[PDB]
């Protein structure tokens, strides 16, 4: 029994503590308080019998406190548990240390059928310790001089096979159509068919040419995720020398340590950082067990970064857009009030620490854009890899069609109109001056 020292019936968390929410399912017919206290201890302290060395350090002060067990709305065996953590249990600005101390060993205890990390309330102190995003939302907007509308990206299709020249010319064709950015594929950094130096050189040349032609500050997302941190820094500095204003990375596969180092280097060198969520589903695909994507989003925002992939939710699955908009709030706003429907179990304030852009990509094209604008607001980016490329008139025409669709949609939204219902009229009116938009809307009606 561990409730007596790791379950607190009347404790109130301190404003400097780290508060964690776990959706817990113990074995059948077990005390919920006991399993919650077991989880809390397994996060900090665990012994199989009487021990000696724990009397040389005050275990009372350096221990977690589960202070509230609430009944989950939908399952009476699953319950939300709120565990506190003294500030001293972590490193000053190490998201890696937070993950190690939170999920390092708790998932291995046999007395828990399922465990899911739901929400984390980071104290203001720990947030002020971490480097945070190198640029921020408003700073990125200033560096790109783009406002009024969300930004427009696209993944370079096919997933691989392109040489440096071919990849560069495809990126140029996508970019010259008014598209804001292009992202390299998450699994493509350096290949036998394509060495990264050639791709970076050709894509920098293409970006410069498109920037000169269209009269707009443009850029492409360059990937630095690689085998070693030395190679990552080398590629990042090579991109810096080539005048490219943004680079991209995979923080889960590369690592939280690598992501933090890359963000610090970007701040030290004045570079923008794009991030993709590769392998996030392996942690959040299961709706009952694992780690919710909001926790990963919080960790990435603390570790630094300017963009984070989300999908929207819509296009294939109407789903539960409430919690998606909730993590969007946690991505953009400095403070977010509690919202059980949005999956926000704590009053979380970020002080004046700049937020992170949201990335919506995958299974989307022109027909979805009004709802995407409505749900994601103006602080987001939309990527249409196949849609822009699969347009019969070419990638440039597809990008132009999506750009004018976005312009018309944001104009109608600024007009004070409910875009979701009359979206068909909006797209028809836009097509009255863009035949490529008309044929695109015809393709995927």
């Amino acid at each position: 029994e561990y409730r007596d020292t790791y379950w607190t019936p009347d404790y109130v968390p301190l404003d400097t503590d780290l508060l964690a929410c776990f959706k817990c399912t113990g074995q059948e017919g077990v005390p919920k308080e006991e399993v919650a206290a077991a989880v809390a201890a397994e996060s900090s302290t665990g012994t199989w019998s009487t021990v000696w060395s724990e009397l040389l350090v005050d275990l009372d002060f350096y221990k977690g406190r589960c202070y509230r067990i609430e009944d989950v709305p939908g399952d009476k065996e699953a319950f939300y548990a709120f565990i506190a953590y003294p500030l001293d249990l972590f490193e000053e600005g190490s998201v890696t240390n937070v993950l190690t101390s939170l999920v390092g060993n708790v998932f291995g205890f046999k007395a828990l059928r399922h465990l899911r990390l739901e929400d984390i309330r980071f104290p203001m102190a720990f947030i002020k310790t971490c480097p945070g995003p190198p640029n921020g939302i408003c700073v990125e907007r200033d560096r790109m001089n783009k406002y009024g509308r969300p930004l427009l990206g696209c993944t370079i299709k096919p997933k691989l096979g392109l040489s440096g020249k071919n990849y560069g010319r495809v990126v140029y064709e996508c970019l010259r159509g008014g598209l804001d950015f292009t992202k390299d594929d998450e699994n493509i950094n350096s290949q036998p068919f394509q060495r990264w130096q050639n791709r970076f050189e050709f894509v920098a040349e293409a970006v410069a040419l498109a920037q000169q032609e269209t009269g707009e500050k443009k850029g492409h997302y360059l990937n630095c995720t690689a085998a070693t941190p030395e190679e990552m820094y080398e590629r990042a500095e090579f991109a810096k020398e080539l005048g490219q204003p943004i680079i991209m990375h995979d923080y889960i596969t590369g690592g939280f340590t690598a992501n933090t180092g890359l963000s610090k280097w970007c701040r030290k060198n004045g570079m923008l950082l794009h991030i993709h969520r590769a392998m996030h589903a392996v942690i959040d695909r299961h709706p009952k067990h694992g780690i919710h994507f909001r926790v990963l989003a919080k960790c990435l925002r603390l570790s630094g970064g300017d963009q984070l992939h989300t999908g929207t939710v819509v296009g294939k699955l109407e789903g539960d857009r409430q919690t998606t908009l909730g993590f969007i709030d946690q991505l953009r706003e400095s403070f977010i009030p509690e919202d059980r429907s949005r999956g926000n179990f704590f009053d979380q304030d970020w002080g004046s620490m700049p937020g992170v852009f949201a990335v919506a990509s995958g299974g989307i094209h022109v027909w979805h854009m009004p709802a995407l604008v409505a749900i994601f607001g103006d602080d987001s980016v939309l990527q249409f890899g196949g849609g822009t490329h699969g347009h019969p008139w070419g990638s440039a025409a597809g990008a132009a069609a999506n750009r004018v669709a976005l312009e018309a949609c944001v104009k109608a939204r600024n007009a004070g109109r409910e875009i979701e219902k009359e979206s068909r009229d909006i797209l028809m009116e836009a097509a009255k001056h863009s035949p490529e938009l008309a044929i695109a809307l015809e393709t995927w009606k």
Binding site: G148, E216, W393, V404, K411, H433
Partner: protein, 107 residues
């Protein structure tokens, strides 16, 4: 069938045909409804790639009338009828441009 020629466009509504005056009224009314502040920028088209354009009279804070904004727009247009003239909404609480687009394009 047919190609899309590259066009020197003007940053978010550079693609669409020039906005009508009623649309300008709606845009400035939206800027008012968001608590932002209007600001007029004019610059020679040759220097479109610069970071800061030549600003008109100081941004109007507490101004909630469309007519004065339209009068200032037409006055600045007559001041430099060959420059590119755009209207920007400034948000004090976020230190960014809430919305911006070109109103008059030069000859």
């Amino acid at each position: 069938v047919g190609d899309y020629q590259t066009v020197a466009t003007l940053e978010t509504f550079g693609f669409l045909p020039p906005m009508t005056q009623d649309e300008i009224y709606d845009q400035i009314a939206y800027i008012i409804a968001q608590g932002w502040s209007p600001l007029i920028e004019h610059v020679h088209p040759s220097r479109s790639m610069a970071t800061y354009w030549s600003y008109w009279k100081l941004p109007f804070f507490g101004e909630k009338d469309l007519g004065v904004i339209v009068s200032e727009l037409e006055a600045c247009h007559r001041a430099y009828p060959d420059h590119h003239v755009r209207l920007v909404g400034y948000d004090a609480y976020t230190q960014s441009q809430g919305a911006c687009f070109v109103v008059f394009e030069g000859r």
